[PDB]
Amino acid sequence: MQQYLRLKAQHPEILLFYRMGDFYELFYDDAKRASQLLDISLTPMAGIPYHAVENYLAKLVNQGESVAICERKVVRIVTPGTISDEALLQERQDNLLAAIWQDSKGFGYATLDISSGRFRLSEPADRETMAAELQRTNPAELLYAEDFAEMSLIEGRRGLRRRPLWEFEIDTARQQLNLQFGTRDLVGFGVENAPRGLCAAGCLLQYAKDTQRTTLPHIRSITMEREQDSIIMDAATRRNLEITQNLAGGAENTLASVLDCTVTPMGSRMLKRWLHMPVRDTRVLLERQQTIGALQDFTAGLQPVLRQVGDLERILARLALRTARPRDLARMRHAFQQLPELRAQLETVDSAPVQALREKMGEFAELRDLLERAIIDTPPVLVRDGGVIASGYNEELDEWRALALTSKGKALALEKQLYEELFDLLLPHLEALQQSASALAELDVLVNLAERAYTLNYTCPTFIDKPGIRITEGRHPVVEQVLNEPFIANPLNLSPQRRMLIITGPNMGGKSTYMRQTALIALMAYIGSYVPAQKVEIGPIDRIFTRVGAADDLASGRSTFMVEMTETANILHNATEYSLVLMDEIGRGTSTYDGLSLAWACAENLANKIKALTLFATHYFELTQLPEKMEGVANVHLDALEIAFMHSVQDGAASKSYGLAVAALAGVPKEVIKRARQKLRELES
């Protein structure tokens, strides 16, 4: 098997499936590794059946192992982060391939999603910023330089690939990006000025082309992300707020669950991206609020029609690579048929953004006519053994079928030839189809947000020039849905005159909920959707900081005081007058004298020098003295009556938080409580 060895030499570290007869067979060391990973029988030869190759590949991709498929040439390389096929891919989640580079100046980062074609680059300078980017992106595959100095960040990620220095060279990168984009200058894209990002991008493009083994028609643009453009949240802040996953790792009880009712899969993925990155620019937000208001009345008619369209973004990418299935094309014909009705309903409503969206969608009538002649309504799964081309598209194919094994073979050859030509006719308009899919996806997200607003009484928010937040009748999006009992509503007022509020309250009195609600409303205003309150006035916000969830991590090697203290440090170092900080009790883990001393100091610094908008929850009642000392801090108290909880914020400072009464509600035995009351009376005495 010298031929296997020579091909293996080309790809030494990647498992190779060699197609012999009807099976793909690994050999030698690869067979041993495969038998352990896929539980196959190690006869050294290990075999995978041709029909179920996708199922096995899915297991290897989850593991992170690259596979090379050989039909002799290697047609393609399948890797985590570079997969276009439906079975490996996830309906409501996306795969990102990333490259990281380190220079003396700083870090360079690039991310490409193969199916959407979205290419983004950035240059994080601090070590901390790179970590936050790595977490939000969650790249499936990371390509890194051999000399990377800090390998602490890269080791956790799955599918790491080590890269040689020559690939990251800047001069080759500028030339390569220019050829694919087709622009002599990257100045129009805006990526020409920053060298480190371009180096990472050149490597990513080179690797992607190598794995795909074909031209990439879909990628036509590159973009740069900057800190001024979006609100910044550290990974700890993101997890505590539970935007897409709860603290225990589950889908339910999340802001996404309340707001995601989208009919199409592409809408769902897009909503999550919008939720993760709040957009600071007021102009895009104003257009979004207006489109939502216009379509609120017509939402019911549009939701059934949109569902039929389905996800087209993925289908277009498969068409670009010429791997599209017969079923994929048929789903597209159905989507085109839905486009005329959508346009008619959209024409009646009159608003400038909505009309533009209607124009972007298009009708593509000529293409639909071609598909209706070209494809049968029920399509056989395999083109290789299928009657996918319908009768009447081609006179010759019909003649061969009527003549009907030479006739069958000729017909089969003709059918495949016609199928390939079909890709060619559809290719000239591929940019137009790609533009439409983006427009339809935006519509689904916007219609869904409108329906939710009507059902749950949401209200549009108003932006202001100075940074401040004012709310009337505020209701938490998640807790209100969960509690059967009526959710009491709490107002909020924050201004440069009153930046900080110290919330002191009885246990189980609603203090944590009030703080989580304020942050969640601000994230919603900046995604441009409606806010659950009677009136919202919101200023500019650069960053959101949350210190609400307490845990100690063994993998981190950190105790609970340590995890809490690390988070306080990030806030003190990176806070800005624009950012909003909400924090829970400080020094809970350690002894009382130390905890009070540390908390008084952190609060004084945040009010006096950082000047950020802040909400502070304290069980230490000495801290209520601090608002008197410093301007810009005020006291607000949640209230409860004995025990029954009012759940309503009032001005003033709470005293005598009750723990023993809460313990009785918990079920602690009465005799234990009786001794405790006696002990407490002694301690106070």
Ligand X SMILES: Nc1ncnc2c1ncn2[C@@H]1O[C@H](COP(=O)(O)OP(=O)(O)O)[C@@H](O)[C@H]1O
Ligand Y SMILES: Nc1ncnc2c1ncn2[C@@H]1O[C@H](COP(=O)(O)OP(=O)(O)OP(=O)(O)O)[C@@H](O)[C@H]1O
Among 279, 508, 565, 572, binds ligand Y (CB under 6 A): 508
DSSP codes joined into one string, 471-528:
EEEE--HHHHHH-SSPPP-EEEEE-STT-EEEEE--TTSSHHHHHHHHHHHHHHHHHT
Quote the radius of gyration of the chain (alpha carbons, Å). 30
Question: Is 684 among the residues that bind a second copy (CB under 8 A)?
Answer: yes
Question: For 622, phi and psi rounded to 5 degrees?
Answer: -65, -35
Q: Is 133 in the site for a second copy (CB under 8 A)?
A: no
Does the annotation flag 509 for ligand binding? yes
> How is residue 372 annotated by DSSP?
H
394 is in an annotated binding site: no
Q: Is 246 annotated as a binding residue?
A: no
Query: How many chain residues are in contact with a second copy, going by CB under 8 A?
Result: 98
Q: How far apart are CA 330 and CA 612, in angstroms?
A: 55
> Using the rule CB under 8 A, is 565 a contact of a second copy?
yes
507 binds ligand Y (CB under 6 A): yes
* Stretch touching ligand X by CB under 6 A, among 86-94, 140-148, 388-396, 550-558: 550-558
Q: What is the Cβ-side half-sphere exposure of residue 464, based on CA atoms within 13 angstroms?
A: 11
Q: Kindly indicate which of the ranges 156-164, 229-237, 413-421, 553-561 contains the residues binding ligand X, using the contact rule CB under 6 A.
A: 553-561
510: contact with ligand X by CB under 6 A: yes
- Contact between 639 and ligand Y by CB under 6 A: the answer reads no
Binding mask 604-643 for a second copy (x = CB under 8 A): xx-------------x-x----------------------
DSSP 543-606: EEEEE------TTTT--HHHHHHHHHHHHHHH--TT-EEEE--SSSSS-HHHHHHHHHHHHHHI
Contact partners, residue 584, CB within 8 Å, separation at least 6:
512, 515, 547, 548, 550, 617
Tell whether residue 508 is among the known ligand binding residues.
yes
DSSP run (H or E) holding 232: strand 232-233
Strand pairing class (161-163; 141-145): parallel
Q: Which of residues 290-349 bind a second copy (CB under 8 A)?
A: 307-308, 310-311, 331, 334
Distance CA 565, CA 18 (A): 54
Q: How many Å apart are CA 641 and CA 244, to the nearest integer?
A: 35
550 binds ligand X (CB under 6 A): no
Query: Binding segment for ligand Y among 314-322, 367-375, 440-448, 504-512 (CB under 6 A)?
Result: 504-512
Tell me which residue has tokens 């393609």. 76
Quickly tell me which residue has 């208001």 as its tokens: 293
459 lies in the binding site for ligand Y (CB under 6 A): no
Nearer to ligand Y, 298 or 561 (CB): 561
Q: How far is the CB of 665 from a second copy (least distance, A)?
A: 7
Closest CB to ligand X among residues 265, 505: 505
Contact 322, 385 (CB under 8 A): no
- Mask for 540-559, x = binds ligand Y (CB under 6 A): ------------x----x-x
Counting contacts by CB under 8 A, is residue 386 touching a second copy? Answer: no
Site for a second copy in 63-102 (CB under 8 A): 87, 91
Helix (H) or strand (E) holding 23: strand 23-27
> From edge to edge, which strands make up the β-sheet containing 97-102?
161-163, 141-145, 97-102, 107-112, 119-122, 223-224
- Per CB under 6 A, contacts with ligand X among 646-685 are 647
Question: Residue 217 contacts by C-beta under 8 Å, 6 or more apart in sequence?
Answer: 320, 427, 430
Q: Residue ranges of the alpha helices (H) in 310-427?
A: 313-320, 326-348, 352-361, 365-374, 395-403, 406-426
- 507 appears as a binding residue in the annotation: yes
- Residue of 560, 570, 574, 624 interacting with ligand Y (CB under 6 A): 560
- CB-nearer residue toward a second copy: 149 or 554: 554
C-alpha–C-alpha distance, residues 167 and 417, integer Å: 39
Q: How far is the CB of 100 from ligand X (least distance, A)?
A: 28
Number of residues located near ligand Y, criterion CB under 6 A: 20
Pick what 555 binds: ligand Y, ligand X, a second copy, none; C-beta below 5 to 8 Å, kind-dependent.
a second copy
Distances (CA, A) of 266 to 310, 311, 527: 8, 5, 17
3-state secondary structure (DSSP) of residue 70: strand
CB of 680 to ligand Y, least distance (A): 17
CA distance 490 to 510: 10
Which stretch in 505-513, 620-628, 665-673, 677-685 sits in contact with ligand X by CB under 6 A? 505-513
DSSP 376: -
- Contact predicate 64/108, CB 8 Å: no
- Of 251-259, 305-313, 503-511, 603-611, the segment contacting ligand X by CB under 6 A is 503-511
Among 512, 534, 570, 574, binds ligand Y (CB under 6 A): 512
Q: Confirm or reject binding of residue 137 to ligand X (CB under 6 A).
A: no
Residue 589 in the binding site for ligand Y (CB under 6 A) = yes
Find the binding residues for a second copy in span 387-426 (CB under 8 A). Answer: none
253-282 positions binding ligand Y, by CB under 6 A: none
266 is in an annotated binding site: no
The count of residues interacting with Mg ion (CB under 5 A) is: 3
Asked if residues 145 and 154 have their Cβ atoms less than 8 Å apart, the reply is no
Q: Quick one: which of 139, 461, 509, 587 contacts ligand X (CB under 6 A)?
A: 509
Does 506 show up as a binding residue in the annotation?
yes
Q: Is 593 in the site for a second copy (CB under 8 A)?
A: yes
**Between residues 447 and 471, which has the closer beta carbon with respect to ligand X?**
471
Q: Which does 247 bind (CB under 5 to 8 A by kind): ligand Y, a second copy, Mg ion, none?
A: a second copy
605 binds Mg ion (CB under 5 A): no
Q: Which residues bind ligand X (CB under 6 A)?
A: 479, 483, 487-488, 490, 505, 507-513, 552, 554, 557, 559, 647
Q: Which residues bind ligand Y (CB under 6 A)?
A: 479, 483, 487-488, 490, 505, 507-513, 552, 557, 559-561, 589, 647
